């Protein structure tokens, strides 16, 4: 059983306009099989709309495609996004009173590398209010949060969206 297309789609921006469905092919063919590859082109002069997409196989094969960034496709360097609100940072809710910092790294740092975790708490009180920010050094890591349909951290089924 294959993923949802919509999931194995990377949109790639910033192309070069010399960039054509072959080379962005032979490029991205290397971290996958390719099952789709376009580049966009106005349909009366053919010129490059400088963007296109490419479907992989499968979402392992996305990952890696994300992971072997920074992109130089026929010289310049090229911006990546899965199938755009680029966000680092997400909002954690249902954390509840028991959350540590720890429990978010330990779960969090396998999406992304974490540069801040704020556990939120009431500015009277100082008790924890049940929700926590954490920012990531990029987008990619949001993009793969927020696609999945559950997170479970401390036993807790949580709430993550974007945030800001
Ligand atoms: C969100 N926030 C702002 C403040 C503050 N310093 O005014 C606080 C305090 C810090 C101690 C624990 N929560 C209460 N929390």
Same mark, same amino acid.
């Given at each position: 059983?294959?993923?949802?297309?919509?999931?194995?789609?990377?949109?790639? *921006? *910033?192309?070069? =306009?010399?960039?054509?469905?072959? !080379?962005?092919?032979?490029?991205?063919?290397?971290?996958?099989?390719?099952?789709?590859?376009?580049? +966009?082109?106005?349909? $009366?002069?053919?010129? !490059?709309?400088? =963007? #296109? /997409? %490419?479907?992989?196989?499968?979402?392992?094969?996305? &990952?890696?495609? +994300? $992971?072997?960034?920074?992109?130089?496709? &026929? #010289?310049?360097?090229?911006?990546?996004?899965?199938?755009?609100?680029? %966000?680092?940072?997400? /909002?954690?809710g249902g954390i509840?009173? &028991?959350?540590?910092?720890?429990?978010?790294?330990?779960?969090?740092?396998?999406? *992304?590398?974490?540069?801040?975790?704020?556990? +939120?708490?009431?500015?009277? !009180? *100082?008790?924890?209010?049940? /929700?926590?920010? %954490?920012? /990531?050094?990029?987008?990619? !890591?949001?993009?793969?949060?927020?696609?999945?349909?559950?997170?479970? %951290? $401390?036993?807790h089924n949580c709430e993550?969206?974007?945030?800001?």
């Amino acid at each position: 059983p294959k993923e949802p297309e919509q999931l194995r789609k990377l949109f790639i *921006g *910033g192309l070069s =306009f010399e960039t054509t469905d072959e !080379s962005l092919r032979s490029h991205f063919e290397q971290w996958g099989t390719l099952t789709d590859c376009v580049v +966009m082109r106005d349909p $009366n002069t053919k010129r !490059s709309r400088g =963007f #296109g /997409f %490419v479907t992989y196989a499968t979402v392992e094969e996305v &990952d890696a495609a +994300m $992971n072997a960034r920074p992109h130089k496709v &026929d #010289g310049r360097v090229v911006e990546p996004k899965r199938a755009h609100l680029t %966000v680092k940072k997400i /909002f954690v809710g249902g954390i509840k009173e &028991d959350t540590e910092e720890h429990h978010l790294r330990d779960y969090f740092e396998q999406y *992304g590398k974490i540069e801040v975790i704020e556990i +939120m708490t009431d500015r009277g !009180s *100082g008790k924890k209010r049940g /929700f926590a920010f %954490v920012t /990531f050094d990029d987008h990619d !890591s949001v993009d793969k949060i927020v696609i999945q349909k559950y997170h479970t %951290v $401390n036993g807790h089924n949580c709430e993550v969206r974007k945030a800001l």
